[model samples]
Target: AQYEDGKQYTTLEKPVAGAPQVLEFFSFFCPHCYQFEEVLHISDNVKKKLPEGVKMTKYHVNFMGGDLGKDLTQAWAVAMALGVEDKVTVPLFEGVQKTQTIRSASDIRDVFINAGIKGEEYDAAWNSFVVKSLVAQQEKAAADVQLRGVPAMFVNGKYQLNPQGMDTSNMDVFVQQYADTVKYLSEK
Candidate 1:
């Protein structure tokens, strides 16, 4: 099968090669991303389809919700540090976009608190060197992609998937094609 460039995926000007990476760029404020993370669980589906050595990593863009975007990214970094991404991922999206409960960093921390992380522990992770570095790395990675929108997926840092090229009328077909395309691109 031949996958045309620009239509299915675009070759990156600078491809990353230290490791096999399937990086996804997303934001908490994006409705499409909200659906992607909480509703459709597209990443989860894609994760299942990916081989063992390939890893899917999500980076929260720092340009969407203004200052709050950075805070959300920090919160996600903390959640990841605490090893509670599965616990806070859905709640963060729901609280911010769906229920409209999260308004500031305090509210974001509360989401982690509710997820069973102690307030002080969350704070420690929030202020940790690891978390700080992760936030910066995410920002740089986001810029490196010249990102224009959320819910963008890249395989091995070389090919960026263009969702419009796939059939999105049916969810099942869309997911299958998405995962298959990612899988194929990862091998390149």
Candidate 2:
């Protein structure tokens, strides 16, 4: 209730409904987003506290990986189509940000292949219409918001988070505030 509009958060021009979407716009190339996921585990942290029926989705921004930005986004769709997000998300992040192993689209595919997804299966999904549609939707969502950075969080497709208003003095406080804001905005 104490969170301020325009400072702590801002309302979107067109509110999105259905399943109380908690969307996070991030990139594999962003070290900060890497920390936000692997180090802080913010998504999992907030996921625990969110009410039922609230689905959290991660959007891969198509502006950070140079020519590979779109490719990484497509890689995400491949993971989604194959239902291997839990198996590949962290490894891809580690490969891209920490290990520096994923430098190209082929490298990204290899991560999925190593995660038990068959190469033939991956190739099938990679070129499928479903994956392509998901990738395009992710691209449009990122651009729709005119996103300028990674690790951006939006609640119900309406409220945009401002970390400055969050109590980041400690991980516990920050996660609690972040979860509460998402909950609040979801119900709003």
Candidate 3:
């Protein structure tokens, strides 16, 4: 499905168009993704420190094998389709990070419900063509983007940044540098 301009691509097409885009390739199961949350927060703080127009989005990377992967994928697509990404993404992130419990579609639906998304809306989105197409698109994107690992960052679809390549002791510095790089790219 083509991304709708105002509702779906509002942030990407308007405020972020021609601006630097940061795509974080991450998996819900990755320990590194959890560990990097602090750095991600720092990066977000630094982005807020910037002038504006720099955009960041995270795509949850998925592979077919795991028991919970399918559920997570469906949840992501449903959240996007329901226009509840901002509300649901953080809770989903925290659910995976904070608890021993598995992240599943039902868990995600509960999160949405708690966040005030109506049950009918959630169900409708889950069953929509857009959500199904989004799931397929996500799988294709992971392959087409040639991701080597989770928690990887692609800046403007040009420069790829990996936290593993940086000095272990200097994570903050590396994350800040990544944000600086994004800022610089936005100006160009």
Q: Which candidate's TM-score is highest? A: 1
By lDDT: ranked, best first: 1, 2, 3
Per-residue lDDT over 1-188 for candidate 1, one digit per residue giving the tens place of the 0 to 100 score: 46888877888888766533889988889998987777678898888888888777888888799989989999878876777888988898899888999999999988888889998898888889999998888887877767888889888778998888888788788778878788888776
Query: Is 1 or 3 the stronger prediction by TM-score?
Result: 1
- Residues 51-149 of candidate 2: C-alpha lDDT, one tens digit per residue: 887788887887888878778999989988888888998998999878899888899989998899999999999999999899988887876676898
Least lDDT summed over 10 consecutive residues: which range in candidate 2?
11-20
- What is the model-wide C-alpha lDDT for candidate 3? 0.62
Candidate 2 regions exceeding 4 Å error are 13-20
lDDT of 3 by residue, 1-188 (tens): 32222321122221222313666666667766666663456446546655656566666666632767677877778876667766876666677767644456677678888999999988888888988888886676566566667766655655555334344567767666655644554444
Weakest ten-residue segment in model 1 by summed lDDT: 11-20
The clash count for each model shown is: 0, 0, 0
- In model 3, the runs with Cα more than 4 Å from the true position are 1-20, 42-46, 49-54, 168-171, 184-188
Instruction: Write down the TM-score of every candidate.
Output: 0.94, 0.91, 0.72
